[PDB]
Fold extralong manganese peroxidase.
Amino acid sequence: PTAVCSDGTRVSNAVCCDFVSLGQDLQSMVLQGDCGEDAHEIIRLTFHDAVAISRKLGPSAGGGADGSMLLFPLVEPEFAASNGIDDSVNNLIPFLSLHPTISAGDLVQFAGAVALSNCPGAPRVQFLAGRPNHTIAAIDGLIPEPQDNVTSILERFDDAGGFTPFEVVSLLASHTIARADKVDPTLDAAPFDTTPFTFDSQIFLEVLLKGVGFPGLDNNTGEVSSPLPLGDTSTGGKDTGLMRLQSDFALAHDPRTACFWQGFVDQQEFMSQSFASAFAKLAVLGHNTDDLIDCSEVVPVPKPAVDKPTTFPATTGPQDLELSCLAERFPTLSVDPGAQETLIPHCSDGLENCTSVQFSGPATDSP
Ligand code: HEM
Ligand SMILES: [Ca+2]
Ligand SMILES: [Ca+2]
């Protein structure tokens, strides 16, 4: 039967109401209403948790979106492909005891939904509840890495959950709010687009620009040349230059994915809706949705899309594009004014001094 929650929210099932206080606590204690570092790491964790499942290897290889990262924090977070996931894992573990009626699998996906809601332009994603509270650790080798080629990436996603090439590119819209801490051992928080706190299509445009240098070292595994490599970190600042992943470049130019990649450029609603649909599928890997309950109403309403059009960043323009898609013309877009590269802020407030919540915990990392 229907019910009304603590905060006035009408739900299809009263058990959804347990998520209201969880959302409040996730925000007050970790996310702080921001599309910042902790939000981004938690969104990354939804993927590392969910994708560790394999049709061909069978259920013993991994249970998908099952909270295995939180329940066995000494196993999967320490596999090489998940280096750095310890931060999100350690931030979420305390909520397991604070909200004991909510399974680890549900906690991971709900935290991701809440984190996304903090990012202007992100969709209000579906949230189904009821993932069982027990599982076992997945095997190693199920998480794509940035040095992987498109055939490998597409096969891994198909084997995980039957994702199509369009759905894979749609999921990679997440790199609009993504940065790298481990790819380059000399850089922290190297952003993948010029607006890492805005859920927009800048990532799609900016990967199509010609690379001209590197924000740090020039020979990291999984990294390729960036169109906007400079930052202020050589003088002690925290505004790291833009980084490009090999996998994003590869997706942008492969015949199976290039038109889907370009198709999101300056198509905000299409991008956000496409991400939402693919992400809802990701969030329930390892489950029959018949066995879950719809609690979508308790996902917060996201911050609205920004007013700003999609544009070329300062010092770039259409002459710098490397295009691969014959089926759709790249749209005419304005160029941001400026004679030098604009520093990409380290913080959503435009400054460099922001700090993030980090709980201590059992998961670890390396360099
Ligand atoms: C081919 C598939 C993918 C590859 C190779 C990949 C690779 C990466 C890499 C190398 C990083 C940087 C980690 C670091 O060094 O700190 C990263 C960050 C991130 N990834 Fe992806 N990723 C993939 C798919 C996804 C998907 C499907 C999602 C979610 C739907 C996702 C969400 C994120 C987010 C939000 C971050 C940023 C974390 C932060 O800024 O703190 N990724 N990814
Ligand atoms: Ca898992
Ligand atoms: Ca962005």
